[PDB]
Amino acid sequence: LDITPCSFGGVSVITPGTNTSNQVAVLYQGVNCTEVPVAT
Amino acid sequence: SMTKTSVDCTMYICGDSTECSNLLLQYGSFCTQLNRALTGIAVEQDKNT
Ligand SMILES: *[C@@H]1O[C@H](CO)[C@@H](O)[C@H](O)[C@H]1NC(C)=O
C-alpha cells in the first residue's frame, strides 16, 4: 500500500472590503474541487 | 522573480499531532512571523514581475 498524506492546503479568503460588503469568497489553495465536496 | 513558497510552520514542525501543536504554542508568534516573512516574499514576486 502507498500512503499519501490527506488533502491539505493554504486557505485564502477574498473580500470586497467589509464596509463595502459582508460577502466573501474562499480560495482553497492547491486543492482539486472534487476534494472539498468529499470534505468548522 | 523566483518561485513563491508557502510553508505551514505548524504542518512542517508538527505533522498531524495535537501534542506537538500544544507544545508549539509555547513559542507563540514564532510560527506566524515565519509565515508573514514568506508571504512578504511571495507578494513581491508579483510586484517584481
Ligand atoms: C466606509 O466607507 C464609506 C464610504 O463608502 C464611509 O462613509 C464610511 O465612513 C467608512 N467607514 C468607516 C468606519 O470609516
UniProtKB/Swiss-Prot annotation, chain A:
Glycans are attached at residues 19, 32. The chain holds residues 585 to 632 of 1273 of the full protein. This is Spike protein S1. Binds to host ACE2. RBD also interacts with the N-linked glycan on 'Asn-90' of ACE2. Cleavage of S generates a polybasic C-terminal sequence on S1 that binds to host Neuropilin-1 (NRP1) and Neuropilin-2 (NRP2) receptors. Interacts with host integrin alpha-5/beta-1 (ITGA5:ITGB1) and with ACE2 in complex with integrin alpha-5/beta-1 (ITGA5:ITGB1). May interact via cytoplasmic c-terminus with M protein. May interact (via N-terminus) with host bilirubin and biliverdin, thereby preventing antibody binding to the SARS-CoV-2 spike NTD via an allosteric mechanism. The lineage of its organism: Viruses, Riboviria, Orthornavirae, Pisuviricota, Pisoniviricetes. Attaches the virion to the cell membrane by interacting with host receptor, initiating the infection. The major receptor is host ACE2. When S2/S2' has been cleaved, binding to the receptor triggers direct fusion at the cell membrane. When S2/S2' has not been cleaved, binding to the receptor results in internalization of the virus by endocytosis using host TFRC and GRM2 and leading to fusion of the virion membrane with the host endosomal membrane. Alternatively, may use NRP1/NRP2 and integrin as entry receptors. It comes from the Viruses. Changing residue 29 to H: In strain: A23.1.
Swiss-Prot record, chain B:
Changing residue 35 to K: In strain: Omicron/BA.1, Omicron/BA.2, Omicron/BA.2.12.1, Omicron/BA.2.75, Omicron/BA.4, Omicron/BA.5, Omicron/BQ.1.1, Omicron/XBB.1.5, Omicron/EG.5.1. It comes from the Viruses. Disulfide bonds join 9-31, 14-20. Precursor of the fusion protein processed in the biosynthesis of the S protein and the formation of virus particle. Mediates fusion of the virion and cellular membranes by functioning as a class I viral fusion protein. Contains two viral fusion peptides that are unmasked after cleavage. The S2/S2' cleavage occurs during virus entry at the cell membrane by host TMPRSS2 or during endocytosis by host CSTL. This is Spike protein S2. It comes from Severe acute respiratory syndrome coronavirus 2 (2019-nCoV). The chain holds residues 730 to 778 of 1273 of the full protein.
